[PDB]
Design a protein around this ligand. Sequence first.
Ligand code: HEM
Length: 393
Amino acid sequence: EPRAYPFNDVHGLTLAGRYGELQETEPVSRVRPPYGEEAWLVTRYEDVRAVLGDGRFVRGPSMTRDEPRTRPEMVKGGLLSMDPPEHSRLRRLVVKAFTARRAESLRPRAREIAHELVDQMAATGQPADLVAMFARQLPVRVICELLGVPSADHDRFTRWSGAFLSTAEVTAEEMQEAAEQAYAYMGDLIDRRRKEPTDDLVSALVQARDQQDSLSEQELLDLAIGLLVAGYESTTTQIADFVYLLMTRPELRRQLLDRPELIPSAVEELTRWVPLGVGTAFPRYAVEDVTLRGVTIRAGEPVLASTGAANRDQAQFPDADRIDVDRTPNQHLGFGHGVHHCLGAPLARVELQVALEVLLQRLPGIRLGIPETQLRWSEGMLLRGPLELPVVW
Ligand code: HEM
């Protein structure tokens, strides 16, 4: 009587029709995931936003619960597993340093890196793999600039970082060695910056103060690695998926070639429209019984608040399945909502705007080098995206 979940097919970006059916007839429903507990699934925009914003729905139990999910292992810890006040304290120190102004200051380096990537693509000739050569490269390098990794170390840091992608074909010991190298490198950079500060994010994190509070050595280290993992695969997949949409919907490419100033707006519309997750991750837990759409969620039960479905809710977004690059208003939940709202969103927006700007300007004719129906799609079971995007231009 729960439904098998996830509903989305991983081989594409289609939103399962089941979501809209539940938005209509069962907006709070039971689901059985592949691993972990059965959970409530919430699908209307209004309810999803309400759950993400509501004090009674917490993430701390994540640490001691068998979370509904699609893969056997649980990746636990980080900001997303904490609740106020502990969460509030760390996030306060991190945003003091990782400001939206800092994000914007990286646009020029981000463009430069994007151009370098496109150079390497042109150097090997059509078709090139846009995933391997651009999408998997740009977001990890930008994180290198953000943190303050010296230029000479970008290549190895990028190499270690790919072991963390859910699509990586590496043994656990291999991923483990990549992780210990990343941690040792990051701990050493943090110690350099303490004694000799620069303008980078690591320096600013080392010096963040909040009425006399500061980040501990371990906090600095976990937060820096945490930003890497939170900021890499997500942005990489979303770059791939936006370019895939650009290449397969000519009207979308034509609109942005004609009016490149629409790119920020298109980034928001695509973030709304693409149901990037396979399912919804990061169940919330009820701290007390809460009634939602006349169903009582009992204290202790997990709730999956689907932003994928929320973002395509006809009640909130006129003609919600239409991609409209000028869509206004566009109060989408693609970067989440409430205290855990994506802290790298300003940087994610910069990156996605730059990726589109630079590819469109360098390769206005970029298109698939194979037919659509032959694309291989990631089965990592966390995010949806193509494994390879061979492109011609
Ligand atoms: C297109 C790319 C991205 C998307 C779609 C995205 C989406 C999200 C979403 C939906 C959340 C909320 C998760 C939830 O509450 O369940 C989140 C949180 C978070 N994101 Fe992102 N994100 C992206 C890029 C980034 C980048 C580039 C960084 C860091 C530089 C980053 C760092 C974080 C962190 C640290 C959190 C946890 C915040 C907290 O718990 O306080 N993200 N992101």
